[PDB]
Amino acid sequence: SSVPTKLEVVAATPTSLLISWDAGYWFIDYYRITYGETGGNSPVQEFTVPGYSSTATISGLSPGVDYTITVYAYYDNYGWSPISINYRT
């Protein structure tokens, strides 16, 4: 199904969060992380993280707002189906 799996928020504050995920055995070149207010107007914010990482900080959030967070994994021009979760600060 999706790579990575077990995408979860492992710590948070009113304006930030720490997500973590699990690639299992897969070698990954990098991940693309997007995030935006669930049912908001804005385009998503986006950033990339190295393939060896399984953790990332998202900050500059606002208190009490729900975010849809999506992680995409890539290896040598293959992209797996992404995994998403929602989390309210």
Partner: protein, 78 residues
């Protein structure tokens, strides 16, 4: 089309790759060497007896979904 290959060191190390059938195996090898912290010259990668070249493709090699590449530490100069 892409297949899953399992790369297994004597180590019992195990890394899975999603490789295009027509893509040179160089990136798989170098990725595995990098993740191991070991130089490329000190690895022998084998599929069914055959040492895998950087320029081999899974297609040239008859590889299929879930095939195993074995990796051994290679000593040179003997």
């Amino acid at each position: 089309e892409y297949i899953k290959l399992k790369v297994i060191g004597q180590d019992s190390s195990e890394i899975h790759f999603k490789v295009k059938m027509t893509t040179h195996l160089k990136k798989l090898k170098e990725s595995y060497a990098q993740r191991q912290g070991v130089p490329m010259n000190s690895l022998r990668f084998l599929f069914e007896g055959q040492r895998i070249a950087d320029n081999h493709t899974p297609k040239e090699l008859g590889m299929e979904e879930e095939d195993v590449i074995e990796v051994y530490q290679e000593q040179t100069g003997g």
